[PDB]
Design an enzyme around this catalytic site. Structure first.
Site, short mmCIF file in Angstrom:
data_model
loop_
_atom_site.label_atom_id
_atom_site.label_comp_id
_atom_site.label_asym_id
_atom_site.label_seq_id
_atom_site.Cartn_x
_atom_site.Cartn_y
_atom_site.Cartn_z
N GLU A 32 -2.13 -6.86 -41.92
CA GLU A 32 -1.88 -6.04 -43.10
C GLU A 32 -1.90 -6.86 -44.39
O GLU A 32 -2.37 -6.39 -45.42
CB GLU A 32 -0.53 -5.34 -42.98
CG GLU A 32 -0.50 -4.19 -42.02
CD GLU A 32 -1.20 -2.97 -42.56
OE1 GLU A 32 -1.18 -2.75 -43.79
OE2 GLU A 32 -1.75 -2.20 -41.77
N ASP A 49 -0.09 -0.46 -51.81
CA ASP A 49 0.69 -1.00 -50.71
C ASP A 49 1.16 -2.36 -51.18
O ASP A 49 0.37 -3.15 -51.67
CB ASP A 49 -0.17 -1.16 -49.45
CG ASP A 49 -0.72 0.16 -48.96
OD1 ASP A 49 0.03 1.16 -48.92
OD2 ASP A 49 -1.91 0.19 -48.60
#
Length: 119
Positions: A32, A49
């Site tokens: 991620e 994010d």
């Protein structure tokens, strides 16, 4: 700040992440954010994010100056070298969605997991 694989594992233990769930967390984070606490990503729908766990704009932290959203935290507090706030929020997302909340985990950590036996 960018962690080495074992540096990350060390920090995660320090924040109470389940030892038997460790390989998954490492796999999730490396996929991620590449273990980078300052990474930000902008998605199609206009959301961002933030940090180590790539926590989202719409549902978990507020872009405001006041803490908010489901983690009751300001997104900017998830871009710091200190990960205690991000860790509490990641544990809250997990407690509710398990690992399915993370795209990176969902389609990269289903097969083999990272070797953390050196850590």
């Amino acid at each position: 700040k960018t962690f080495t694989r074992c540096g990350l594992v060390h920090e995660l233990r320090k924040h109470g992440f389940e030892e038997n769930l460790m390989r998954n967390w490492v796999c999730l984070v490396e996929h991620e954010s590449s273990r980078d606490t300052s990474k930000t990503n902008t998605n199609r729908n206009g959301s961002k994010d933030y940090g180590l766990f790539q926590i989202n704009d719409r549902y978990w932290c507020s872009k405001g100056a006041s803490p908010g959203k489901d983690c009751n935290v300001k997104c900017s507090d998830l871009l710091t070298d200190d990960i205690t706030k991000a860790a509490k929020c990641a544990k809250k997302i997990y407690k509710r969605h398990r690992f399915d909340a993370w795209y990176g985990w969902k389609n990269h950590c289903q097969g083999s997991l990272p070797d953390i036996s050196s850590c």
